[PDB]
Design an enzyme around this catalytic site. Structure first.
Site, PDB file in Angstrom:
ATOM      1  N   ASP A 135       0.837  -1.193   0.000  1.00 50.69           N
ATOM      2  CA  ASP A 135       0.000   0.000   0.000  1.00 50.69           C
ATOM      3  C   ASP A 135       0.876   1.248   0.000  1.00 50.69           C
ATOM      4  O   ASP A 135       1.651   1.474   0.936  1.00 50.69           O
ATOM      5  CB  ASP A 135      -0.923  -0.010   1.215  1.00 50.69           C
ATOM      6  CG  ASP A 135      -1.855   1.183   1.249  1.00 50.69           C
ATOM      7  OD1 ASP A 135      -2.675   1.328   0.317  1.00 50.69           O
ATOM      8  OD2 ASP A 135      -1.774   1.973   2.212  1.00 50.69           O
ATOM      9  N   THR A 141      -4.008   6.144  -5.408  1.00 52.31           N
ATOM     10  CA  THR A 141      -3.109   6.991  -4.631  1.00 52.31           C
ATOM     11  C   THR A 141      -1.706   7.000  -5.226  1.00 52.31           C
ATOM     12  O   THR A 141      -1.061   8.052  -5.294  1.00 52.31           O
ATOM     13  CB  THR A 141      -3.073   6.515  -3.179  1.00 52.31           C
ATOM     14  OG1 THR A 141      -4.410   6.321  -2.703  1.00 52.31           O
ATOM     15  CG2 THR A 141      -2.370   7.530  -2.296  1.00 52.31           C
ATOM     16  N   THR A 142      -1.217   5.837  -5.660  1.00 53.91           N
ATOM     17  CA  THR A 142       0.118   5.753  -6.240  1.00 53.91           C
ATOM     18  C   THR A 142       0.182   6.314  -7.656  1.00 53.91           C
ATOM     19  O   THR A 142       1.260   6.729  -8.094  1.00 53.91           O
ATOM     20  CB  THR A 142       0.619   4.299  -6.246  1.00 53.91           C
ATOM     21  OG1 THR A 142       1.918   4.244  -6.847  1.00 53.91           O
ATOM     22  CG2 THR A 142      -0.333   3.353  -7.008  1.00 53.91           C
ATOM     23  N   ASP A 182     -13.722   2.588   1.679  1.00 51.96           N
ATOM     24  CA  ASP A 182     -13.269   2.735   0.302  1.00 51.96           C
ATOM     25  C   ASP A 182     -14.420   2.592  -0.684  1.00 51.96           C
ATOM     26  O   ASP A 182     -14.361   3.152  -1.785  1.00 51.96           O
ATOM     27  CB  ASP A 182     -12.181   1.706  -0.010  1.00 51.96           C
ATOM     28  CG  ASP A 182     -10.901   1.959   0.759  1.00 51.96           C
ATOM     29  OD1 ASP A 182     -10.857   2.932   1.540  1.00 51.96           O
ATOM     30  OD2 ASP A 182      -9.938   1.183   0.582  1.00 51.96           O
TER      31      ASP A 182
END
Lengths: 69, 46, 435
Positions: free
Chosen positions: C45, C78-79, C303
């Site tokens: 993560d 997010t990445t 989420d």
């Protein structure tokens, strides 16, 4: 990288409780060969999926060579 | 293989049997752990 | 020589994306982080990777906040935001070598960002928000890529009928859930002996249900339910649910600081239904056996709500696996052919920055990084965004037919917060320390 093999036998000790040493030798030699694949321009992702199917058929070929009580 | 003599030996007649849950779970846990060590692709040190 | 700082902020931000890029996608590579206490951890993560990096350079400090900004707006990919900003600055070094000013590049990306959302609008498929069947498919499809993917079909609809607090305790299982119109707490009513109260009035410290040894005994004589040990997170929700207010003094206890409830009992959770106050609230009861299962169960629904929030703002859907990114990299190359000045060479470099996302997913999928993106450019030129990268099977397939979908807001916010942050780096001439 070594502690992965410590917890490897702990899970095998509770369910089965024997032959935990042979589990560490199989995984140890697999990475020696898997790194050689990376040296031959092979990504680790393709090696993971190939190992999971090699493990899938390994249980099947065992079941095709079992003996009953 | 006869471990006491160092030769081939028919296990059905010799009686060298083993459970099913030993050889099956050992190959699963050994393959799953090797995937974890090879899934690692970075090294960070604080 | 002001190039000494602009070159350092790029290489400082480049090193962050070069590392975390391997953890892209569900089939990404993990990492081995060594903490200051001595122990290590194995996690892919990205939110936890950069949070433990403990960066010092200002250019890299902005990337940590860049990932946190996407977590609040869209909540997914997010990445993907750090990789785009990392690849953009990698192309900017090619521009500064040509003798282009940083401010010229900023306004050129304003045109690429303007035309960037346009390319996603023509390809995106609008949908109906009221159709819960589309809300369930759009939510359950993306939920399969989470950690708890087996119990995703049952946690998705609990977010549909609620749209929001999530109560969780040990014992039971994940499949059983119940929507509470009122509020529920994780505390008990000890040391009270009633445990069942009709005609309840609540007031945060006439009042029969108190939400806070001699005081335990006197409060039981008047038959008043004593509930204590409540953290502050519940004080913000109970006020809006039932209409209570805090009482910080004994003399300040009056009728204007109480509430009402048709039922407030402990069925050990405090099921309190019948708010009977103006407001919009709901609480979802979640069960689970182990502690690690209920913690991931909260993230599964939390989420899931990020996808519901994405469909409300942007009632549209787009293909996954870098499918719309190929259209973004190809159509911007054509728009630059008609432009002049220093904007054409900058819009071209902005398209090359997005080519690395499918090339990196092709790397993490085991395919060739080049043959994967090079074949999709013609498939999108002659076709559309249906074909893309399928990481589950490890090959090129129809992403719309493979049941992989993401909302329009995720890819839009990933490019806006990323391009605006690069422009903040281009607007930096030098940094000085104060005291």
């Amino acid at each position: 990288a070594a502690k992965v093999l410590c917890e490897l036998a702990d899970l095998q000790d509770k369910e089965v409780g024997d032959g935990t040493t042979s589990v560490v030798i199989i995984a140890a030699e697999l990475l020696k060969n898997a790194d050689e694949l990376v040296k031959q321009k092979i990504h680790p992702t393709s090696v993971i999926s190939g190992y999971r199917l090699a493990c899938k058929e390994a249980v099947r070929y065992i079941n095709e060579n079992l003996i009953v009580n | 293989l006869d471990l006491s003599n160092g030769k081939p030996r028919d296990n059905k007649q010799a009686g060298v049997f083993e459970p099913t849950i030993v050889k099956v779970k050992s190959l699963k846990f050994a393959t799953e752990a090797a995937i974890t060590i090879l899934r690692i692709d970075d090294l960070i040190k604080l | 020589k002001p190039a000494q700082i602009r070159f350092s902020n790029i290489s400082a931000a480049k090193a962050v994306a070069d590392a975390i890029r391997t953890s892209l996608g569900p089939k990404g590579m993990d990492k081995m982080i060594q903490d200051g206490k001595g122990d290590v951890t194995i996690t892919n993560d990205g939110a936890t990777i950069l949070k433990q990096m403990q960066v010092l350079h200002p250019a890299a400090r902005m990337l940590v906040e860049l990932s946190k900004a996407q977590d609040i707006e869209a909540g997914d990919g997010t990445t993907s935001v750090v990789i785009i900003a990392g690849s953009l600055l990698d192309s900017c070094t090619k521009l500064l070598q040509k003798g282009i000013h940083p401010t010229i590049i900023s306004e050129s990306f304003q045109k690429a960002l303007e035309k960037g959302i346009e390319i996603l609008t023509d390809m995106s498929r609008p949908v109906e928000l009221s159709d819960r069947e589309t809300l369930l498919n759009s939510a359950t499809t993306s939920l399969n890529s989470k950690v708890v993917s087996q119990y995703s079909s049952l946690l998705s609809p609990m977010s549909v009928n609620a749209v929001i607090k999530i109560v969780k305790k040990l014992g039971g299982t994940i499949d059983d859930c119940e929507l509470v119109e009122g509020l529920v707490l994780t505390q008990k009513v000890s040391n009270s002996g009633i445990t069942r109260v009709e005609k309840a009035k609540i007031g945060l410290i006439g009042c029969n249900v108190l939400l806070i040894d001699l005081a335990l005994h006197f409060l039981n004589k008047m038959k008043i339910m004593v509930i204590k040990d409540i953290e502050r997170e519940d004080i913000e929700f109970i006020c809006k649910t039932i209409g209570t207010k805090p009482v910080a003094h004994i003399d300040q206890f009056t009728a204007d600081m109480l509430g009402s409830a048709e039922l407030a009992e402990e069925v050990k959770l405090l099921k309190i239904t019948g708010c009977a106050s103006p407001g919009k609230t709901v609480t979802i009861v979640v069960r689970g056996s182990n502690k690690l299962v209920i913690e991931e169960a909260e993230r599964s629904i939390h989420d899931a709500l990020c996808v519901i929030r994405c469909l409300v703002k942007k009632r549209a859907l787009i293909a996954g696996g870098g499918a719309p990114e190929i259209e973004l990299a190809l159509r911007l190359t054509e728009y630059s052919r008609t432009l002049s000045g220093m904007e054409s060479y900058c819009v071209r470099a902005f398209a090359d920055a997005m080519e690395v996302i499918p090339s990196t997913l092709a790397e993490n999928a085991g395919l060739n990084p080049i043959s994967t993106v090079t074949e999709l450019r013609n498939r999108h030129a002659q076709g559309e965004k249906t074909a893309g990268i399928n990481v589950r099977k490890g090959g090129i397939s129809n992403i719309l037919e493979e049941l992989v979908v993401q909302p329009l807001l995720v890819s839009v916010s990933a490019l806006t917060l990323a391009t605006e942050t690069v422009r903040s780096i281009l607007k930096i001439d030098d940094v000085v320390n104060t005291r």
